[PDB]
Each structure stands twice: as structure tokens, then as C-alpha cells.
Ligand SMILES: Cc1cc2nc3c(=O)[nH]c(=O)nc-3n(C[C@H](O)[C@H](O)[C@H](O)COP(=O)(O)O)c2cc1C
Ligand SMILES: [Cl-]
Ligand SMILES: [Cl-]
Ligand SMILES: [Mg+2]
């Protein structure tokens with residue numbers, strides 16, 4: 001099955017298009033919380049075109065060997081609106097199995113109103129099955145270079161808070177919070193907010 005999805009808004013494209021890693025957005029108000037957008041890296045990772053993806057739950061990547069104790073942690077994150085990083089067996093369009101380090105995180109529209117989910121997918125090679133631990137080491141070292149305000153803005157943002165909630169928590173203006181966010185993005189060479197949530201969760205700070 002597949003549902004017809006409205007063309008994605010600019011904020012959806014801004015979240016994933018410039019990411020170097022496979023990234024997707026789902027809309028939980030549509031049938032089966034289906035993908036509403038994928039970036040180019042998702043098509044090159046999986047072999048699926050945007051036409052084949054949009055309208056479908058991302059569990060189309062699952063197959064015979066997929067670990068239900070690890071997918072349930074994603075279901076849990078979707079339910080509790082909390083970010084989850086698991087490494088699960090998935091299958092490309094050509095049936096090629098691959099280990100997928102998948103982040104699923106709650107994210108808000110550019111008006112901070114409605115909830116969506118951001119997904120991002122990194123292949124862990126059969127050659128080098130501990131690649132995930134090397135990403136977490138890199139993430140932890142980068143996040144340690146941040147100033148104290150930048151680090152705690154990053155922590156609250158990656159936890160899935162709207163800017164208005166981060167601003168409430170820290171006694172700042174939304175404008176000030178977005179200023180600190182931008183500075184983190186520039187300092188750590190992060191193209192998208194999705195890339196920022198990924199290193200936070202990799203590091204263990206959210
Ligand atoms: C944004 C997003 C991205 C997802 N990416 C993947 C993925 O790459 N591979 C996968 O097997 N599941 C992925 N999932 C998880 C499934 O869509 C589903 O949430 C999970 O399998 C647990 O639900 P279920 O028990 O109904 O399958 C993603 C979920 C969301 C919301
Ligand atoms: Cl889901
Ligand atoms: Cl302020
Ligand atoms: Mg495209």
C-alpha cells in the first residue's frame with residue numbers, strides 16, 4: 001500500500017536535502033506514519049526512488065532477519081517522542097542485506113506547531129561492523145569543543161524540543177536560541193538540523 005502525500009514544504013527540504021547522509025521525514029498524521037520526503041543520499045543508499053518511498057512506512061526496508069527488539073525501540077521513541085539510534089538489518093531495493101544505523105527523532109515544522117519524525121540511515125559495512133562506535137567517538141570529541149551555552153542548546157534541541165521550549169527552559173528569546181544553534185552548525189560543519197541531532201545522539205548527549 002501507499003498514500004498520496006502533499007508536496008513537501010520548504011522546511012521539510014531544508015531539514016534533509018543538504019545532509020550527506022540518507023535522511024527522510026515522516027508525517028504521523030498520515031496513514032501508517034509514512035515518509036513524506038527522502039534526500040538524494042537515501043536513494044543512493046537503498047536504490048529506492050522518491051516515487052517508490054513517499055506514502056509508505058520506512059519499515060519497507062525491513063526483511064526476514066530484522067530485529068523486532070530493536071524496531072520496538074523505534075516504536076517506543078515514536079510513542080514517547082524521544083530520539084532513538086539502533087543498528088538493524090535492512091534490505092536494499094535489490095534485496096542486498098545491510099546493517100543500518102538508523103536515527104529516528106521527533107521534529108517540529110518551521111512554525112513549531114505540528115510534530116513530524118526525522119530519520120537518518122548510515123550503512124555499517126560487513127567489513128567494519130564497529131563503524132558505529134567510531135562515529136560515536138568522533139561525535140563526542142566534536143561536541144566537547146562547544147562552549148557551555150552551545151552545548152546545552154544542542155542537548156535540548158537534539159532531545160526534540162521546539163525553539164520556544166528551549167527558550168522557555170534557558171530563559172532566552174527564540175531569536176537567541178536560533179543564534180546559538182546557527183553558531184553550532186557553522187562550528188561543527190553541519191549542513192542540516194538532522195546532522196546536528198545525529199551527532200548529539202551518537203555522542204550520548206540526547
Ligand atoms: C522517520 C522514520 C524513519 C525510519 N527509518 C527506518 C529505517 O531506515 N529502517 C527501518 O527498518 N525502520 C525505519 N523506521 C521504523 C519503522 O518505520 C517503524 O517505526 C518501526 O519498524 C517500528 O514500528 P513497527 O513495530 O510497526 O514496525 C523509521 C521510522 C520513522 C518514523
Ligand atoms: Cl511508525
Ligand atoms: Cl535572550
Ligand atoms: Mg530529490
Ligand SMILES: [Mg+2]
Nearest residue numbers: 059068071072
Ligand atoms: Mg514488526
